[PDB]
């Protein structure tokens, strides 16, 4: 096999939600409260949510 | 984690059933990726019985 | 439960340099981005520095001055306080944020002209 991936989809001081595409073996999970960087410094500049 | 994880009838079939184990784990911090935890390819272990 | 023991604040004059250090009960750094805030007595507190695996990012406020450094193995953030000033008196809380939220209980640091 080979495990296929997709971009995080990242959204600042807001929440989301799982769209399930039924492909096989799908597995989507949201997590809350993270602080990623890029580059650039931090990509965004909120602390929660 | 053995023979029979992917199934689909035929070369062209475009559909599979997939038996697999993919279990999510949460990111790093301050990092953007999709970490993962699942069972091995069966046909690994397989070919090496 | 998780906590943050801060160290290293006392009493110094302007021009001089201090070092904090917080200390977590546990390994948490690793899953966890550490961040230094200072409060004004009456002011709401307010980010000085943050580090994760990163980098370190430092408020504009203090750049230049202030540096943040971690150290994962003795579980241990220091913030290397350099050229202070007078405004610089306050109470600083080492800050641990990841899936729960910690703070420091903090320690006072006063620099007089």
């Known amino acids: 096999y080979k495990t296929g991936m997709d971009s995080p989809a990242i959204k600042c001081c807001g929440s989301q939600e799982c769209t399930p595409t039924y492909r096989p073996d799908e597995q989507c999970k949201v997590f809350t409260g993270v602080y990623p960087f890029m580059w650039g410094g931090a990509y965004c500049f909120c602390d929660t949510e | 984690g053995a023979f029979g994880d992917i199934q689909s009838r035929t070369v062209s079939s475009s559909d599979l059933y997939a038996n697999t184990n993919l279990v999510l784990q949460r990111p790093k911090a301050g990092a953007i990726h999709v970490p993962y935890t699942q069972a091995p390819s069966g046909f690994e272990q397989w070919k090496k019985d | 439960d998780v906590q943050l023991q801060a160290s290293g604040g006392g009493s110094v004059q302007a021009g001089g340099s201090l070092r904090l250090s917080c200390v977590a009960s546990?390994?948490?750094?690793?899953?966890?981005?550490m961040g230094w805030y200072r409060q004004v007595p009456g002011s709401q507190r307010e980010r000085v520095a943050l580090?994760?695996?990163?980098?370190?990012n430092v408020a504009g406020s203090v750049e230049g001055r202030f540096t943040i450094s971690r150290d994962n193995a003795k579980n241990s953030i220091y913030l290397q306080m350099n050229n202070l000033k007078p405004e610089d008196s306050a109470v600083y809380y080492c800050?641990?944020?990841?899936?729960?939220?910690?703070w420091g209980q903090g320690t006072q640091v006063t620099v007089s002209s």
């Open positions: 800050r641990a944020f990841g899936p729960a939220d910690y």
């Open positions: 546990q390994n948490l750094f690793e899953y966890y981005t």
């Open positions: 580090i994760n695996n990163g980098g370190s």
